[PDB]
Amino acid sequence: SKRTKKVGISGKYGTRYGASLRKLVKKQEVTQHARYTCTFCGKNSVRRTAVGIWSCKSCKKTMAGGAYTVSTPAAAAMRSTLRRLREITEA
């Protein structure tokens, strides 16, 4: 039973702040309130503690991540690039 056609989590803001700003805050709010799978224990229990901080309730590990997502695409691209320059430097 879908209760709102389009606003979703932004329905708490009512008719205020403008449609575009409610739609803009909706993306970050969904991705910051979602649960993630831990890369250390494999359970779906990683949630945000503060801005940039992501903690797992099962294995008690705390990670430094993005503001509203657990990881940033720029950081993932850096991880790949850093690996490739690591084999370039070592070899």
Partner: protein
């Protein structure tokens, strides 16, 4: 290849899934192969490698996580490590 070997092992041979049953198999000495997932905690990984060195059983380091190891075993739950006690029709030991 390793996934097909595990599928044949589940179909024909005998396994135990999990850390405590794997430890009991290593203590009994009837373990033929020990599979350890990539994201297993390093302390548990070092302990299982030490146990396998004492019992002279081979260790395969599965590149996937515990979710992917459970999916490879055909289970709907996670599995960090497992012990194959009987190969059945598969050739997973001959490697």
């Amino acid at each position: 290849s390793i996934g097909a070997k595990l599928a044949l092992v589940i179909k024909s041979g005998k396994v135990v899934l999990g850390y405590r049953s794997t430890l009991k198999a290593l203590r009994s000495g009837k373990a033929k192969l020990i599979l350890i997932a990539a994201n297993t905690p390093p302390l548990r990984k070092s302990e299982l490698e030490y146990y396998s060195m004492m019992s002279k059983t081979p260790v395969h380091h599965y590149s996937g996580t515990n979710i992917e190891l459970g999916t490879a075993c055909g289970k709907l739950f996670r599995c960090s490590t497992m012990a194959i006690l009987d190969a059945g029709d598969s050739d997973i030991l001959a490697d």
